[PDB]
């Protein structure tokens, strides 16, 4: 019938895209990335042990001037910190104690959060009154918020547990574009340096690139063994950094448009909860579930050194805008700035 | 160093004082996780003490603070956010005892009892819940006393082998629930048979959280 006709059409489309992407398999990355001088070992040490929280930390985001540092935790408090002096600036009392995402605006006037309350509360740091006030409370998601990255003072891009990514504003508070197409729940969200494109990763083991201006998808990168939990851009802006729940950091492109590789490692069988980048792009950093982080040489596909230091699993990890020091955030209510 | 730096560090230390003082009310608080099956009596246990995620209600019974984690509105999968409740003191289930007759009340494809068993096996043998107490409740049992008078109990469990009464069926459901636990050496299941208008279940919850905080006070001293 018509149902059988559309099932046959879906099968024919699957065969067509399989044949096209099998014919488009042309090159690889290993020899090109390994035709360079070998990268030496990296041995970092903790220089600022950031403490003050007393609950479990899931999220962090760096500052505008690579100096301030926001931290989200289940204590009902969002605290904005200081990297050098290990001081702190404000205390934001969260109305919802369940936060698993937070992001700091590139202008620094606003900070956002989100979690299991299925709403996004946008705060205002700069006020004539001495406090932090909620600017807009974004409502319209039926799932847990996973990432709340900022494009500018108005456009905030929010991932959520309703299998859709969203783009909002401030003057009205109404979502403009909805990014539908991920089957599973989106876990992380990474923008692009030119602030025109952004990527996402969901429970369907796929990474899909979305054009923010048109509100429609552009690319897909699937074929993985578990849920992708960590996504990150490249400083060049044309590469992925996928972190999933099988201790695998695959490297894709925003331009290769089908696939690059399926990277894996054998010594670690835990999960990955945060993946960050470096300024030169030669080295990759990932927050793991076996209580440490791994310094990944993105070219020779090697490890510069097991960069341990945390007692619990590193939930969140971030690198400054100038790449001067990394910062890991784990479940020990601590942050570990390393350089 | 400087006057701005001195005032900044004294303000930061004042906010650390605030985090200590307000955050030490978390030790007094005894948070409870509520989940299970919808329509099975979640509203009944709420009504005994705009957000589409976790619903919170606050109540204090005999000098003890409680938190209600109504997580039933989270329509997504439970795998990627149940890890936020590692340190919850007690878990409260509300599965309907009046469940052997009706299969879904929306369609004919499975049993709500089978779904309750699958969920119980999922969140009892969980790696993240290997040391957490359960206050599993078999609610609306007053209505269970009429549907067993006519419909035989073999329509759900074909291992009855006896006259269809209340106590044998209740014991069979108890045997089918209290065997899913992988180890009772570290877990207790505080099963209480309650109803829609049944009172004094709050003291049962209080006794259960009393037992788990006494095992906590045995834990922190290091001998247990």
């Amino acid at each position, epitope marked *: 019938s018509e149902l059988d006709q559309l099932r046959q059409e879906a099968e024919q489309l699957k065969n067509q895209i399989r044949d096209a992407r099998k014919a488009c398999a042309d090159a690889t990355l290993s020899q090109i990335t390994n035709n360079i001088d070998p990268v030496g070992r990296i041995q970092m040490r903790t220089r600022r042990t950031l403490r003050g929280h007393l609950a479990k930390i899931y999220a962090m985001h760096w500052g505008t001037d690579s*100096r*301030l540092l926001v931290s989200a935790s289940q204590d009902g408090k969002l605290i904005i910190w*200081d990297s050098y*002096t290990t*001081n702190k*600036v*404000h205390a934001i009392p969260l109305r919802s104690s369940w936060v698993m995402t937070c992001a700091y605006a590139p202008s620094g006037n606003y900070v956002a959060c989100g979690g299991l309350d299925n709403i996004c509360s946008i705060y205002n740091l700069k006020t*004539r*009154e*001495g*406090n932090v006030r909620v600017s807009r409370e974004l409502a319209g998601h039926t799932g847990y918020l996973s990432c709340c990255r900022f494009l500018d003072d108005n456009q905030i891009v929010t991932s959520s547990g309703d299998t859709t990514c969203a783009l909002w504003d401030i003057e009205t508070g109404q979502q403009t574009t909805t990014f539908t197409g991920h089957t599973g729940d989106v876990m992380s969200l990474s923008l692009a340096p030119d602030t025109r494109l952004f990527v996402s990763g969901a429970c369907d083991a796929s990474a899909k690139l979305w054009d923010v201006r048109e509100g429609m998808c552009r690319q897909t990168f699937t074929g993985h063994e578990s849920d992708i939990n960590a996504i990150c851009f490249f400083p060049n802006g044309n590469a992925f950094a996928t972190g999933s729940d099988d201790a695998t950091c695959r490297l894709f492109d925003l331009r290769a448009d089908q696939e690059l590789m399926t990277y894996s490692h054998d010594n670690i069988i835990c999960g990955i909860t945060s993946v960050s980048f470096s300024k030169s792009g030669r080295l990759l950093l990932a927050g793991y579930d076996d209580f440490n982080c791994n310094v990944w040489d993105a070219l020779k596909a090697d490890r510069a050194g097991v960069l341990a230091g945390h007692d619990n699993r590193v939930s969140c990890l971030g690198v400054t805008d100038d790449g001067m020091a990394v910062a890991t955030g784990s479940w020990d209510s601590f942050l570990k700035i390393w350089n | *160093l*400087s*006057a*701005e730096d*001195k*005032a*900044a560090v*004294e*303000r*930061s230390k*004042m906010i650390d004082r605030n985090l200590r003082e307000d955050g030490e009310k978390a030790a007094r608080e005894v948070k409870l996780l509520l989940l299970g099956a919808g329509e099975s009596g979640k509203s009944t246990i709420v009504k005994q003490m705009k957000t589409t995620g976790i619903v919170e209600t606050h109540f204090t019974f005999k000098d003890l603070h409680f938190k209600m984690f109504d997580v039933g509105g989270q329509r997504s999968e439970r795998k990627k956010w149940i890890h936020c409740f590692e340190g919850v003191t007690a878990i409260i289930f509300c599965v309907a005892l009046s469940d052997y007759d009706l299969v879904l009340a929306e369609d004919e494809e499975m049993n709500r009892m089978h779904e309750s068993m699958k969920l119980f096996d999922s969140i009892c043998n969980n790696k993240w819940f290997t040391d957490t107490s359960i206050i599993l409740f078999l609610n609306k049992k007053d209505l269970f006393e009429e549907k067993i008078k006519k419909s035989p109990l073999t329509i759900c469990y074909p291992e009855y082998a006896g006259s269809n009464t209340y106590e044998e069926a209740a014991a069979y459901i108890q045997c089918q629930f209290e065997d899913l636990n992988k180890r009772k050496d570290t877990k207790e299941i505080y099963t209480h048979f309650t109803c829609a208008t049944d009172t004094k279940n709050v003291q049962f919850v209080f006794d259960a959280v009393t037992d788990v905080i006494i095992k906590n006070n045995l834990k922190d001293c290091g001998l247990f």
Partner: single-chain antibody
Amino acid sequence: VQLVESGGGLVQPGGSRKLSCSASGFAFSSFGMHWVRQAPEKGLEWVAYISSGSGTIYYADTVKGRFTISRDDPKNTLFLQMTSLRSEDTAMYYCVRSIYYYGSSPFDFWGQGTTLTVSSSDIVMTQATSSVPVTPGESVSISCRSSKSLLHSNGNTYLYWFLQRPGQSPQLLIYRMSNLASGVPDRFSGSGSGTAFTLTISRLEAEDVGVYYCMQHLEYPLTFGAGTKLEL
């Protein structure tokens, strides 16, 4: 709202008065409150300081143990208990709030002031210019010279520039490198890579009239500079 000052009037020499700051409409418990006076014919000078929650109380070197500054957090008020009111204290008093963190804006608000009339190794900075005749639309620079350097290993200069319109209260201007105040036009631009201070004002308007004041916050007391009246 605004910081409102209560009390005043003629007082006996060496006696006591009832001077307070009945201020409201602001988050009082987070600001490092100040008190700044000025003579009827002389510029401003710091006289008191308390931090948030009265954690740290400072004074000027000439007022140590002479005045009593206290705060009241629940009523958001600000007290000033006097002792031994000499005729040298014949000055009107301002109430100043100052928040203190990274990238904060101290001295960002000043009260309307109250008039107290008495009846019958410190760092020193000054402005050589005074009573400068200006014309609208013309670039007018300013000069302040400090005795000691204000830079650090971090690279932060602690110069503060102010403005008092005639018949009004002082306002705030540049206080860092390219960091202006709130409600201030962007024509102002402080400069000076050392212990010399200059405002490179691009254009002058009718609202850019008044007396400029040069300030430090490196050490206490927070003594001001000399008056520089930018009259027409």
